[PDB]
Each structure stands twice: as structure tokens, then as C-alpha cells.
């Protein structure tokens, strides 16, 4: 999705301001929002790819103006409705339609073990690797309206495979109920000049990006 979240290479966002001595949570409401994510993922109410794409689909001004955990709050209020877990009315009123019909999967007894374990996207088997480290590759020019992880700034550009990480779930399909379609993910190295041109670049600098096998073709 060619949305406002795809920031790489954009101008006009200004200085990187940083708060001195920033706490983990700057407001109490942020603690609630942050802790809801693992709870809802544990339920299987949605997967992380769907979660990312839900944020991608929010209004561009909303995305810009919202502080970080407002983006998450948006997902909970909207993706849960899209998935049929909550109704629009429940969300608007804050009042359940019919009592405690579910049971939380994330319980106090399993919090530590679940957070210490996580859920790797690595998979045992998937499409064979077409590329080896050292191969020159070009990123395909694709412009899906749905979820993808090839940033706009890389499309059509030529880089060098520098790491093959092995097999992983494909977010483009997993975000849209089309399965995991596991395939190789590579780190691909691009020169500053290749990405940004002669003027806007520095001779030494390189940008590495992690890209799925079928995002690429031989250069």
C-alpha cells in the first residue's frame, strides 16, 4: 500500500526531536493500550500482519497527528470490528451486547512464558531460494493496494544479496487470509547513489533492506 506510513526518503518531517530522560510510558492510558496487544494476539483475534495493515489503512492525517499508541487504539477499535470480534455499536458505546462470552487466553500464569517465548515467523519449509549471497538483484516494481513490505524507495532499484536469512511467512498473503506462503528473506544492500541519485548521496553509505524472494528478480 503506497500510504503515508511508507516514510523512507520523504522530506519535510523536520528535526529528530528527542525527549530527555523519556519514560517507557509517558501517559497512564498508554500502559493499557500497549498491554492490550499481546492479550488480543494471544486470543488469535488477528495476526500481526493484519495489525500492521490496519494501521496502514487509517486516514493519513490521523496517522500523522496521532501519537504512537493512538495508532494501536485505532486498530483495536476497527480491526476487531472487521474481524467480527466486536460490533460497531459495542465499540461506540463501550458496552458489551451480551455479557462474558469469551475467556481471555492471556492469563497471569502464562504471561512470563509467553513474553519470553514470542512467536517466530521462521518456517521449516517454503519456496526454494532463487538467490545466493553476492547475487545482484532488482526489486520488482509492484504497487499493491494491500499489505507489502517492499518500501517504495527500493522499487526498481538494484542491490546485492548480502544475507539469506532462511524461510519466513509472507506478510503480503498472511495479512489478507491467503495463507503463509513461506519463502526466503534476504538482506539486500543498496548504495546511496543507487537509491537517491548522484547529488543526494554520499559515496560511502549503504542501505540494507530485508526483502522476500518473490519481491526480486535477477539484475
Amino acid at each position: 500500500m503506497n500510504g503515508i506510513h511508507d516514510t523512507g526518503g520523504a522530506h519535510g518531517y523536520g528535526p529528530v526531536y528527542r525527549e530527555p530522560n523519556e519514560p517507557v510510558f509517558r501517559y497512564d492510558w498508554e500502559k493499557t493500550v500497549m498491554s492490550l496487544l499481546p492479550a488480543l494476539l494471544a486470543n488469535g483475534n488477528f495476526n500481526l500482519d493484519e495489525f500492521r495493515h490496519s494501521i496502514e489503512r487509517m486516514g493519513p492525517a490521523h496517522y500523522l497527528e496521532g501519537t504512537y499508541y493512538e495508532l494501536w487504539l485505532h486498530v483495536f477499535e476497527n480491526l476487531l470490528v472487521e474481524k467480527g470480534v466486536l460490533t460497531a455499536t459495542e465499540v461506540a458505546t463501550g458496552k458489551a451486547a451480551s455479557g462474558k462470552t469469551a475467556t481471555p487466553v492471556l492469563t497471569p500464569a502464562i504471561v512470563d512464558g509467553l513474553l519470553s517465548t514470542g512467536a517466530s515467523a521462521a518456517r521449516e519449509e517454503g519456496a526454494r531460494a532463487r538467490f545466493a549471497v553476492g547475487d545482484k538483484v532488482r526489486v520488482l516494481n509492484k504497487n499493491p493496494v494491500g499489505h507489502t513490505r517492499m518500501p517504495r524507495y527500493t522499487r526498481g532499484k538494484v542491490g546485492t544479496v548480502v544475507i539469506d536469512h532462511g524461510v519466513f511467512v509472507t506478510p503480503d498473503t498472511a495479512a489478507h487470509g491467503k495463507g503463509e506462503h513461506p519463502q526466503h528473506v534476504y538482506t539486500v544492500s543498496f548504495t546511496s547513489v543507487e537509491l537517491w541519485g548522484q547529488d543526494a548521496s554520499s559515496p560511502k553509505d549503504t542501505i540494507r533492506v530485508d526483502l522476500w524472494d518473490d519481491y526480486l528478480e535477477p539484475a
Binding site: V16, T32, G94, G118, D205
Partner: protein
């Protein structure tokens, strides 16, 4: 000149009420357990943060065999010090050297190694850092007081997949015979993102 889109802008005045309403709803429906949620918050407020990564770095500095294991398998390496899990399932450690300065970003969102660095600060997840780090890293680093030599390569890693990166910064000169603990005190969060260097004694 207010903050507008740098991550530190003011939230809506009614945000806490909205959040409370959603929380009550999800609890009433039986979707979430508030006691478990409190444990998640305690975990990221008090238990998981950059002191973890700093221990990893200090150990790699004093123990070349550990450093080698860590660079070969980041996840297994950090697990040796008891660090693991959510948003660090598949870790890759980036060794800075006199020839290469590494730094990472997530241009598409906020991806960051929680088990060793904790939750990211607001600037890391905001558009100024995300947009500019892949195009003008030297200009961004300068804003942090860090000037990389012109002849030193900067490698910017965009965290676009489910690998998570952490930088193993270079050990400061003049720290002969420091214990792991004294070395760890020098290792800042910025030094492990690549946006700063370890404290110089």
C-alpha cells in the same frame, strides 16, 4: 512550532476516557484479563530495557568466544544471558568496526528489538527519524551530536521483515581491565541503535 508529528505532540484531551471505555468493553466480553495486562506493563516498565543489551555488549567485549557465538546466532547468543521472546525471536547482531558504522530503523513502522532494548522511544517510531535515516544518515546523526568520519562507511539497516537488529558498538579506548559491569555502564541505548557511541571514560 508546537510538536505536530515528531512523536511528542499532545494526544486528544479525551484519550484516557476512550481507552478506559475500550478496556471495560474488552474485559466485560471476556477478551482480556486485567491482571495479566498488569503483568505485561510491569514487564516492560521494570524488567525489560537497554540494561539487557548492555550486558550482552559488555560480555562480547570481554569474551571473544561469546562474541563469536553471538555474531553467528544472535537469538542463541542473547539467550545465554536469559534474554528472549517477543520482538526478538530472530536477532541479528551488527558489529561496528573501524571501517563500518551500523544503525537501524523501521521506515514502515516501529520494529525494534524488545528483549534487549525494551520498548522503543517515541522518536524512533516517528516520521522525522524514519523518513531521513535511510536518505541522510549523516545529517540525522549530527543532530544527536554524532559525526562519523567521512571515510567511514555508514550501513543503515531498514527493519522491513521479522529479523530484529541490535548494534554491537565498539569498545571505548582506555577501558583496559574493566569488569563486564563497568563496561556495561558505558553502553548507552543510542550506542546499541547506532545513533550514539558508548560513553568514553
Amino acid at each position: 512550532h508546537d510538536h505536530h508529528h515528531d512523536g511528542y505532540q499532545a494526544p486528544p484531551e479525551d484519550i484516557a476516557l476512550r481507552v478506559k471505555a475500550l478496556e471495560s468493553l474488552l474485559i466485560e466480553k471476556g477478551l482480556v484479563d486485567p491482571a495479566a495486562m498488569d503483568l505485561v506493563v510491569q514487564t516492560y516498565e521494570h524488567k525489560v530495557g537497554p540494561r539487557n543489551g548492555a550486558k550482552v555488549v559488555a560480555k562480547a567485549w570481554v569474551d571473544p568466544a561469546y562474541k563469536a557465538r553471538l555474531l553467528a546466532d544472535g537469538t542463541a547468543g542473547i539467550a545465554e544471558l536469559g534474554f528472549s521472546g517477543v520482538q526478538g525471536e530472530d536477532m541479528v547482531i551488527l558489529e561496528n568496526t573501524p571501517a563500518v558504522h551500523n544503525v537501524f530503523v523501521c521506515t514502515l513502522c516501529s520494529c525494534y528489538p524488545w528483549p534487549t532494548l525494551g520498548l522503543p522511544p517515541a522518536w524512533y517510531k516517528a516520521a522525522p527519524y524514519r523518513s531521513r535515516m535511510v536518505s541522510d544518515p549523516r545529517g540525522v546523526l549530527a543532530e544527536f551530536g554524532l559525526v562519523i568520519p567521512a571515510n567511514k562507511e555508514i550501513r543503515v539497516w531498514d527493519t522491513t521483515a521479522e529479523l530484529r537488529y541490535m548494534v554491537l558498538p565498539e569498545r571505548p579506548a582506555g577501558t583496559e581491565a574493566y569488569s563486564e559491569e563497568q563496561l556495561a555502564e558505558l553502553v548507552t541505548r543510542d550506542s546499541m541503535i547506532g545513533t550514539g557511541l558508548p560513553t568514553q571514560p
